[PDB]
Design a protein around this motif. Structure first.
Motif, PDB file in Angstrom:
ATOM      1  N   UNK A  97      10.003   1.892   9.423  1.00  0.00           N
ATOM      2  CA  UNK A  97      10.208   0.480   9.814  1.00  0.00           C
ATOM      3  C   UNK A  97      11.001  -0.214   8.713  1.00  0.00           C
ATOM      4  N   UNK A  98      10.630   0.039   7.461  1.00  0.00           N
ATOM      5  CA  UNK A  98      11.209  -0.634   6.268  1.00  0.00           C
ATOM      6  C   UNK A  98      12.701  -0.313   6.155  1.00  0.00           C
ATOM      7  N   UNK A 136       3.198  -8.904  10.045  1.00  0.00           N
ATOM      8  CA  UNK A 136       1.893  -8.196  10.015  1.00  0.00           C
ATOM      9  C   UNK A 136       1.859  -7.136   8.906  1.00  0.00           C
ATOM     10  N   UNK A 137       2.931  -6.360   8.728  1.00  0.00           N
ATOM     11  CA  UNK A 137       2.965  -5.255   7.725  1.00  0.00           C
ATOM     12  C   UNK A 137       3.091  -5.817   6.301  1.00  0.00           C
ATOM     13  N   UNK A 138       3.536  -7.062   6.115  1.00  0.00           N
ATOM     14  CA  UNK A 138       3.556  -7.707   4.774  1.00  0.00           C
ATOM     15  C   UNK A 138       2.262  -8.490   4.538  1.00  0.00           C
ATOM     16  N   UNK A 139       1.401  -8.606   5.549  1.00  0.00           N
ATOM     17  CA  UNK A 139       0.096  -9.287   5.445  1.00  0.00           C
ATOM     18  C   UNK A 139       0.239 -10.780   5.680  1.00  0.00           C
ATOM     19  N   UNK A 140       1.091 -11.167   6.632  1.00  0.00           N
ATOM     20  CA  UNK A 140       1.571 -12.566   6.775  1.00  0.00           C
ATOM     21  C   UNK A 140       1.418 -13.066   8.212  1.00  0.00           C
ATOM     22  N   UNK A 184       0.857  -1.216   0.000  1.00  0.00           N
ATOM     23  CA  UNK A 184       0.000   0.000   0.000  1.00  0.00           C
ATOM     24  C   UNK A 184       0.884   1.254   0.000  1.00  0.00           C
ATOM     25  N   UNK A 185       2.033   1.195   0.670  1.00  0.00           N
ATOM     26  CA  UNK A 185       3.018   2.302   0.785  1.00  0.00           C
ATOM     27  C   UNK A 185       3.860   2.390  -0.498  1.00  0.00           C
ATOM     28  N   UNK A 186       3.735   1.421  -1.404  1.00  0.00           N
ATOM     29  CA  UNK A 186       4.345   1.491  -2.745  1.00  0.00           C
ATOM     30  C   UNK A 186       5.429   0.452  -2.992  1.00  0.00           C
ATOM     31  N   UNK A 187       5.859  -0.315  -1.986  1.00  0.00           N
ATOM     32  CA  UNK A 187       6.947  -1.326  -2.119  1.00  0.00           C
ATOM     33  C   UNK A 187       6.466  -2.497  -2.978  1.00  0.00           C
ATOM     34  N   UNK A 188       7.383  -3.113  -3.727  1.00  0.00           N
ATOM     35  CA  UNK A 188       7.074  -4.204  -4.696  1.00  0.00           C
ATOM     36  C   UNK A 188       6.892  -5.538  -3.959  1.00  0.00           C
ATOM     37  N   UNK A 189       5.979  -6.387  -4.431  1.00  0.00           N
ATOM     38  CA  UNK A 189       5.631  -7.683  -3.788  1.00  0.00           C
ATOM     39  C   UNK A 189       6.878  -8.551  -3.642  1.00  0.00           C
ATOM     40  N   UNK A 190       7.837  -8.409  -4.554  1.00  0.00           N
ATOM     41  CA  UNK A 190       9.062  -9.249  -4.543  1.00  0.00           C
ATOM     42  C   UNK A 190      10.033  -8.702  -3.500  1.00  0.00           C
ATOM     43  N   UNK A 191      10.237  -7.382  -3.442  1.00  0.00           N
ATOM     44  CA  UNK A 191      11.042  -6.711  -2.384  1.00  0.00           C
ATOM     45  C   UNK A 191      10.592  -7.225  -1.010  1.00  0.00           C
ATOM     46  N   UNK A 192       9.271  -7.334  -0.814  1.00  0.00           N
ATOM     47  CA  UNK A 192       8.597  -7.628   0.487  1.00  0.00           C
ATOM     48  C   UNK A 192       8.832  -9.093   0.878  1.00  0.00           C
ATOM     49  N   UNK A 193       8.575 -10.039  -0.021  1.00  0.00           N
ATOM     50  CA  UNK A 193       8.715 -11.497   0.254  1.00  0.00           C
ATOM     51  C   UNK A 193      10.177 -11.840   0.550  1.00  0.00           C
ATOM     52  N   UNK A 194      11.132 -11.146  -0.067  1.00  0.00           N
ATOM     53  CA  UNK A 194      12.590 -11.363   0.107  1.00  0.00           C
ATOM     54  C   UNK A 194      13.026 -10.792   1.455  1.00  0.00           C
TER      55      UNK A 194
END
Length: 377
Positions: free
Chosen positions: A343-344, A367-371, A15-25
């Motif tokens: 946080x990021x 929690x912030x990655x929806x996990x 939601x803050x604009x970070x890419x789904x791949x950046x997040x899972x890694x």
């Protein structure tokens, strides 16, 4: 509707604009540094073929809260091996088989498994029970001790019925449905209150207790409204059953905003994310982020619940940023995106005091990655 009903989890990094791949890694790299990282970063230590512990690095011991924390991180990340190693250690060394604490766990021990005190911590038990219910739903029951569901039910039986089984006491006050600081003492710790977990206990525990757990969830939401400061949003580490700060104890002054009370803002945020039951939760989240927006992480202190700052610096300032950022699940004010971004760009803490910072850090990353999810069936 909450994520329990919709099945959809807010990914605030995305939601803050970070890419789904950046997040899972980032999330896979946060796990890898904690469980298999270097000497200055890791908090998980494997032992023999079938055991492991979460080390409280500051206090040089193993704590029921840490073990149960590790077990939640593992079931959230789908890591059965680490889960089972942690659960074997807790079962084997910490759980009592007889006496006034039968089926409770000794709150701390030496890393070799030597009990240092039989005093249990309700903190630990409620997290062991929620992680074991989740393990059962994701993976399914094996032979004891890996019959996850029966293990969870046996812990929550003891939590409500210890008084009837002999000379012991339960971890919930039956009159007011509130979790206690310890079984023997007539006050509470607001950060121990997990209405979101009691909701799921009301589904997965022994049938005879399910009505009680439902009232406990309702009761804990009311409690947190009386415990959290209406202006600043800070709660005391120990509070009375009426929500006022509990008297100074022999082991210290727990009337202020410190380590324990940081988990409140995250606890409130996740109940809102899962159940959307109490709109106060949004304003409570807005208040604590509003309180900390102008303050640097490195300038964080002890505060009175009135916002009066002490000279003393916070012992776990990355833990506190983590819990403030987690409150973005509920907050919709002008500081929510700032905390998600802040946080990021915060790494894991290293060194002697890293344990509590890095646990809280990881639950925020989940929690912030929806996990940080409910695992059902």
């Amino acid at each position: 509707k909450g994520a329990y009903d919709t099945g959809t989890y807010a990914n605030l990094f995305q939601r803050s604009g970070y890419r789904e791949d950046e997040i899972k890694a980032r999330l896979e790299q946060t796990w890898n540094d904690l469980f298999y990282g270097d000497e200055h970063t890791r908090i998980y230590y494997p032992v023999g073929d079938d055991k492991g512990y979460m080390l409280d690095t500051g206090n040089d011991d193993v704590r029921s809260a840490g073990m149960s924390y590790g077990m939640m991180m593992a079931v959230q990340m789908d890591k059965k091996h680490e889960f089972d190693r942690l659960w074997n250690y807790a079962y084997t060394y910490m759980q009592h088989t007889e006496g006034r604490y039968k089926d409770y766990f000794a709150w701390h021990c030496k890393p070799d498994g030597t009990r240092l005190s039989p005093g249990p911590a309700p903190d630990g038990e409620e997290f062991f029970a929620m992680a074991l219910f989740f393990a059962s739903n994701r993976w399914g029951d094996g032979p004891a001790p890996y019959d996850y569901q029966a293990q969870a039910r046996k812990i929550l039986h003891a939590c409500l019925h210890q008084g009837e089984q002999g000379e012991g006491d339960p971890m919930w006050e039956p009159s007011n449905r509130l979790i206690k600081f310890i079984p023997e003492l007539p006050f509470s710790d607001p950060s121990y209150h997990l209405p979101h977990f009691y909701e799921l206990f009301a589904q997965y525990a022994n049938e005879q207790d399910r009505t009680f757990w439902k009232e406990a969830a309702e009761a804990s939401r009311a409690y947190l409204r009386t415990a959290c400061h209406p202006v600043t949003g800070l709660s005391p580490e120990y509070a009375n059953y009426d929500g006022t700060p509990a008297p100074v104890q022999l082991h210290g002054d727990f009337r202020h905003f410190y380590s324990d009370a940081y988990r409140v803002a995250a606890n409130v945020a996740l109940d809102w994310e899962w159940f959307r039951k109490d709109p106060w939760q949004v304003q409570q989240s807005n208040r604590i982020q509003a309180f900390f927006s102008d303050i640097d992480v490195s300038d964080y202190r002890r505060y009175t619940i009135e916002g009066e700052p002490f000279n003393e610096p916070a012992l776990h300032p990355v833990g506190l940023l983590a819990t403030n950022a987690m409150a973005s699940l509920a907050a919709d004010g002008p500081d929510a995106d700032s905390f998600v971004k802040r946080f990021w760009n915060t790494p894991l803490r290293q060194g002697k005091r890293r344990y509590y910072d890095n646990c809280l850090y990881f639950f925020t990353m989940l929690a912030l990655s929806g996990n940080y999810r409910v695992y059902q069936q």
